[PDB]
Amino acid sequence: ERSKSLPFLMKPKNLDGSMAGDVGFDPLGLSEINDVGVDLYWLREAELKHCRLGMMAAAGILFVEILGPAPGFPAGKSQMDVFWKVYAEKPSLIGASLAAIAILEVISGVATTQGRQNGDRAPGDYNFDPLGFGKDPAKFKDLQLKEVKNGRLAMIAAAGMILQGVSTHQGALENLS
Amino acid sequence: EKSKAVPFLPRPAALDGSVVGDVGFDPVGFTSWLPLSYLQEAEIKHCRIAMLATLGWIVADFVHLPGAVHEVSSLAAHDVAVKSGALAQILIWTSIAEAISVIAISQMLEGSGRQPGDFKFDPLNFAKDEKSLKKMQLSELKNGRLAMLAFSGIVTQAALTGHAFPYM
Ligand code: CLA
Ligand SMILES: C/C(C=C=C1C(C)(C)C[C@H](O)C[C@@]1(C)O)=C/C=C/C(C)=C/C=C/C=C(C)/C=C/C=C(/C=C/[C@@]12O[C@]1(C)C[C@@H](O)CC2(C)C)CO
Ligand SMILES: CC(/C=C/C=C(C)/C=C/[C@@]12O[C@]1(C)C[C@@H](O)CC2(C)C)=C\C=C\C=C(C)\C=C\C=C(C)\C=C\[C@@]12O[C@]1(C)C[C@@H](O)CC2(C)C
Structure with missing residues (x-):
């Protein structure tokens, strides 16, 4: 009856055990929202998209700062400020990436709403397993848990890197030391 | 269900299998409120023009x-x-052809039996049976889509950088 994460709180009604990373940590009861097209399905899809985006962004920042930029690309070690140097010399790359992300996000929203309507697609599912790393069950649950935990950690990390780069105008590991 | 192109999206419900070049690609559901023959004719016209x-x-x-x-x-x-x-x-001759096209597309939409984009123009044969016609229709559609994207890129690059044939 009590949430596993917060023993002083009752179990959130909509979070039983199903989703990976579920420990009952919903103090504000946001999982019970059923308005403005927002429900547990939409919240989970948003959480998974945030997890994946944060993982990609943190990996990119760390890669560029440690191993350096790719040939022909600007340096500076400040990832929040090197973006304007890339846009100053290769605006077409940024524009094409933005257009591609826009199209993919329109497709993602359509897929989310459709899967919410005629329930056949789990939240965050895009059938993207080209290498077959999660075919069999009893490993899919473990992979989902790993992805969720890594994505939450990378969300926090990427938000921290964004704020550090905006404020200190220095590199992430530069702030570290 | 689960259209071929986008495996996580539902089938567009208007493209089952009976159209050449039908991989079930209509995420925004253009076929849900427009005639399929009309869209097919528009796509084929764009393909040929481009x-x-x-x-x-x-x-x-x-x-x-x-x-x-x-x-x-x-x-x-x-x-x-x-x-x-x-x-x-x-412009004059294209307008003549497009008025005849107005008549043709109207007749196709109101019965007739003319396939979208089928003007019966075939001096040579190049398509003897149903199988050859289907294969060549698929080739025409794929080449036309590729050429539409290619002309888009060519014009955008040439306008961005006033270069010769290599528009890089
Ligand atoms: C979308 C179709 C299209 C359009 C709008 C144009 C437009 C133009 N072309 Mg052009 N061209 C086209 C296709 C097209 N071309 C094709 C397919 C070829 C390869 C044979 C050429 C080869 C070509 C050359 C070599 C030259 C032009 C030139 C020009 C410019 C002035 C003279 C002229 O009209 O071309 C004259 C066109 C030709 C001599 C060949 C056209 C052959 C046609 C397109 C193929 C048969 C199609 C058939 C007649 C369709 C019937 C239509 C129906 C309604 C009855 C003008 C901007 C001239 C210019 O100023 O260059 C900058 C020039 O020197 N074009
Ligand atoms: C209606 C809609 C879409 C939809 C739909 C459909 C289509 C109807 C389908 C469904 O049926 C429903 C629904 C709702 O899904 C809404 C669209 C979404 C919006 C409104 C898009 C918002 C995106 C904004 C982002 C993601 C911007 C991020 C900015 C960054 C800045 C980066 C910086 O580097 C910059 C530039 C400068 C640097 O110095 C430092 C920083 C600041 C870090 C980080 O990235
Ligand atoms: C949109 C795009 C790029 C957009 C870039 C933009 C907006 C950038 C704009 C800017 O930089 C400028 C200009 C100047 C700056 O001052 C301002 C900004 C704004 C910064 C590229 C698309 C590029 C699109 C491309 C490359 C498409 C390739 C498509 C292929 C290969 C298709 C193949 C098929 O069609 C066939 C062949 C057969 C079919 O049946 C099957 C498939 C597979 C679908």
Whole structure:
């Protein structure tokens, strides 16, 4: 009856055990929202998209700062400020990436709403397993848990890197030391 | 359910299997409120127009017709051809063809039996049975889509950088 994460709180009604990373940590009861097209399905899809985006962004920042930029690309070690140097010399790359992300996000929203309507697609599912790393069950649950935990950690990390780069105008590991 | 192209999206519910080049790609559901034959005709018309346009752009940046008016790049050829009246002739004959097309598409939508884009233009055969016709329709659709995207890229790159045939 009590949430596993917060023993002083009752179990959130909509979070039983199903989703990976579920420990009952919903103090504000946001999982019970059923308005403005927002429900547990939409919240989970948003959480998974945030997890994946944060993982990609943190990996990119760390890669560029440690191993350096790719040939022909600007340096500076400040990832929040090197973006304007890339846009100053290769605006077409940024524009094409933005257009591609826009199209993919329109497709993602359509897929989310459709899967919410005629329930056949789990939240965050895009059938993207080209290498077959999660075919069999009893490993899919473990992979989902790993992805969720890594994505939450990378969300926090990427938000921290964004704020550090905006404020200190220095590199992430530069702030570290 | 679970359209072939986008495996996580539902089938567009208007494209089951009985159209050439039908991989179930309609995420925004254009076929849900527009006739399928109308959209097919529009797509095939775009394919043919853009194939001709890509070939003409690339060729005219290499070979020029005799005369001083034809000595401009394809990027600047529009303002020269419109002034000389060269594009007026193309406009006149294209308008005639498109009025006949108005009649044809109206008849196709109101029964008839004319397949979308089927003008029966076939001096040579190149398509003897149903299988050959289907294969060549798929080839035409794929080549037309590729040429539409290719002309888009060619024009955008040439406008961005006023370069010759290599528009990099
Ligand atoms: C979308 C189709 C299209 C359009 C609008 C244009 C437009 C133009 N072309 Mg052009 N061209 C095209 C296709 C096209 N071309 C193709 C496919 C080729 C390859 C043979 C060429 C080869 C070409 C050359 C070599 C030159 C031009 C030039 C020009 C410019 C002025 C003279 C002229 O009209 O061309 C004259 C066109 C030709 C001599 C060949 C056209 C052959 C046609 C397109 C193929 C048969 C299709 C058939 C007749 C369709 C019937 C239509 C129906 C309604 C009845 C003008 C901007 C001239 C210029 O100023 O260059 C900058 C020039 O020197 N074009
Ligand atoms: C209606 C809609 C879409 C939809 C739909 C459909 C289509 C109807 C389908 C469904 O049926 C429903 C629904 C709702 O899904 C809404 C669209 C979404 C919006 C409104 C898009 C918002 C995106 C904004 C982002 C993601 C911007 C991020 C900015 C960054 C800046 C980066 C910086 O580097 C910059 C530039 C400068 C640097 O110095 C430092 C920083 C600041 C870090 C980080 O990235
Ligand atoms: C949109 C795009 C790029 C957009 C870039 C933009 C907006 C950038 C704009 C800017 O930089 C400028 C210009 C100047 C700056 O000052 C301002 C900004 C704004 C910064 C590229 C698309 C590029 C699109 C591309 C490359 C498409 C390739 C498509 C292929 C290969 C298709 C293949 C098929 O069609 C066939 C062949 C057969 C079919 O049946 C099957 C498939 C597979 C679908």
